[model samples]
Target: MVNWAAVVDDFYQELFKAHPEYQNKFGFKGVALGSLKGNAAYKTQAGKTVDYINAAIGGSADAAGLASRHKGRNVGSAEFHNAKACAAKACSAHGAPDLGHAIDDILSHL
Candidate 1:
């Protein structure tokens, strides 16, 4: 099994490094990006993001509902695709390239 928590951590770390503005989009509006590492909300949301991805890969995710929910937060295909890239990179760094590609395949159509 994958150590998804580590991958998710790497994903968020790299994503935030590249796009600090994303911190505002995901319920961390005023918090500094560096401070998110141990923040409770950040931890929960990061775990939830991994869960959502796993569900999507397992064919049980509510893609439309999730899309709509993110839409409400001003998230769209562009943002999702960026996240996919970040996730894929993290997975690869962690020696899970196949999982990374799987995630990439799913998010490509989002």
Candidate 2:
């Protein structure tokens, strides 16, 4: 029902555009943000973002696991909230607002 790849790609794009600090949190520290396009690590992260969004929309989200992993990477509450907004916006912009809400609902618990 959505362009999942675009959603994930824009999710990070919007997040970084709004708060460049997120790149560092995601381990892209010191890597020029502009150079991230087509970057291997960025692509891998984009894939994982889509996976989680799909799981949430499918009602099979592993919120705890997701939370744990992000927490380990230093993504605290604020980062979660901000990224959630970016992700939801990406989904909505891609014509999948319901997918956005599903992610909002699932990620809220994490």
Candidate 3:
């Protein structure tokens, strides 16, 4: 199982480094799951929720597409699901109610 909290932490660290002004405005400060064992089943469900949210929001580089481009490998369905779950959790906790709004906010700033 992937360490979801660590992944999010790394993402936020990078994000804050790139955009220092947004350090506090963007999202929640602490990790959600912490050291507790993450629920694989729930992660999968969250992934599905993210997919739907992404499609509904509509973006040129959606979560799966961005993951594939960055990793240089086709993200398998399972991994895509996990990625979406991580993204949704991270974004939602930071004040984005859904993926579309999160993407929009990020793009607007960029």
Candidate 4:
């Protein structure tokens, strides 16, 4: 395995630090995933974000669940697109541009 969780951890941590004010936007404003490492909330956020990425790539997303959970969050494709871009940038910075670029290219179509 490629330690996808660690990849996401690095991505979000980079993004969060670059824009700490956007913590809530990333995962509800508790603490940075890097700072919380191994904490349940970090795990949950990482799992959820990864699931969405997989869903975007796998094309088997549970639309209903996505809508239900994010409905009240006032989200839109725009937020995801921005996140995709951020992930790509972080990956590029970390020598994993392949992952970020790959995800950004796919999610761009959404």
Using TM-score as the measure, the top candidate is 2
Report, for every candidate in turn, its global Cα lDDT versus the true structure. Answer: 0.75, 0.73, 0.43, 0.61
The numbered model that scores best in lDDT is 1
Query: What's the lDDT for candidate 3?
Result: 0.43
Error of 4 at 93 (Å): 5.1
Two-way lDDT contest, 2 vs 3, winner: 2
- Candidate 1 scores a C-alpha RMSD against the true structure in Å of 2.5
Deviation of model 3 at 86, angstroms: 0.9
Between candidates 1 and 4, name the one with more favorable TM-score.
1
Which residue pairs clash in candidate 3? 27-94
Which residue pairs in candidate 2 have backbone atoms (N, alpha carbon, C) closer than 3 angstroms, thus clashing? none
- Per-model root-mean-square deviation over C-alphas: 2.5, 2.3, 14.2, 4.1
Per-residue lDDT, model 3, residue 96, is: 51
Q: Which stretches of candidate 4 lie over 4 Å from their true place?
A: 25-28, 62-71, 93-110
lDDT string for model 3 (1-110, tens) is 33434344444444444444433332332323342225454345345444545554564436444445434543244443444455665655655543434444333323
lDDT per residue as tens, model 1, 1-110: 77777788888888888888888767666677678776888988988988976786687877667767777877777877787778778888898643554545445446
Q: Model 3 shows how many backbone clashes?
A: 1
* Model 4 Cα lDDT, one tens digit per residue, 1-110: 34456567777876676656667754457764546675776778888767765665567766556644554576546655656666776566656534544444444444
- TM-score order, best first, reads 2, 1, 4, 3
